[PDB]
Ligand binder design. Sequence first.
Ligand SMILES: COc1cc(/N=N/c2ccccn2)ccc1NC(=O)c1ccccc1Cl
Length: 414
Amino acid sequence: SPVQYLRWGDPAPIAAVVFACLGLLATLFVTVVFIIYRDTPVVKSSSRELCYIILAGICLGYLCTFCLIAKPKQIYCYLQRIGIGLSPAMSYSALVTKTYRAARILAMSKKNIFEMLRIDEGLRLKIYKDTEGYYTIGIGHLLTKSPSLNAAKSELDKAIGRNTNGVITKDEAEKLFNQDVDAAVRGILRNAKLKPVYDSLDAVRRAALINMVFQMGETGVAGFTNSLRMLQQKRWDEAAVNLAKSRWYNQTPNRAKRVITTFRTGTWDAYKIMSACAQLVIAFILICIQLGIIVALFIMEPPDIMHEVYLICNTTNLGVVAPLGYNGLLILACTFYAFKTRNVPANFNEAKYIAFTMYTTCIIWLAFVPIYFGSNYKIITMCFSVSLSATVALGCMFVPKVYIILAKPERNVR
Ligand SMILES: COc1cc(/N=N/c2ccccn2)ccc1NC(=O)c1ccccc1Cl
């Protein structure tokens, strides 16, 4: 009885049980809220089905405390090992599936910009110089400002990760172009004239603005004050009419016609250019791998009480460390794809929060390695550890969305 341990001068059990219960309530609230408001654009935009798996994971994370603070029965040693290994595996298998898909969507998004400017500006697959005289390759990608061609080859090889002999492929030029886009988009957001326009525009019309920036630079695109304001107000037909009067249109009419037409339609029409049930099956597989590890260890080192509210089991270091390792890989993958997609604005900046969640989760899990092994109160540290990691995931991912559903029904709009 955790109440008895409180009476005696030990409040750790009762704390753990309370943390866990507030956890379950909060998860039950968040869940029933997502069911009720499933039709709205803040739940329907993301993967509704993966969230249920993430919430089950969080839920089961809180339920672990009821097998760690338990009566000495055989099955609770079985459920301890299932819960402490499978609850994070449910949350992060679902999450890594979500973040990987965001990353593939981001990659395929950057491919259109690249195809756009391949057609508009060109591409050389072997080293050349710009009109200054500095070594360049692909879509005007700068290598070095050194007169040494070897330096250019040197920095190219580093940039790609093979000996290129100064020659690359379309896909390695794409890779290089994505640095130059990110660079150009940083300049734009540092620039008070361009920043509000880029903010306003959909993905396709941002491609159009980056194109112009790539042709005339930032200070040049800031020239088009009126045209820029027309686009901000989403006045497409009038922005086209105005830009079609420019020195820009009269000096490079072929490229200008295409960029302008793209500002009108918000489509790719002017240029030559990941499932749902898949994510459940992949998430389910990634989770059965963790089950395989736990069931394997149940045969190698069968669960058994050691022999009292702290239920102590025989679980050896390999019983702890094997699932820990796999959970760690899941976390590191999640963090990797999350960070890759951190600035993706889709679904009310879902990506910004997920990145923050994963950064926290890394410091927590890495912290609780020396803490747990260095500790003589392992069942308690395990209790607070699981619940904390689960609260972080619920806190940083689900609260921000439940907030908008409940507090800001007006902003809950596509
Ligand atoms: C960070 O602590 C843990 C959290 C766990 N679940 N979190 C959850 C669970 C559900 C949803 C989100 N998050 C599971 C095991 C944990 N710890 C360990 O298994 C462990 C054991 C020994 C040494 C170090 C560690 Cl890190």
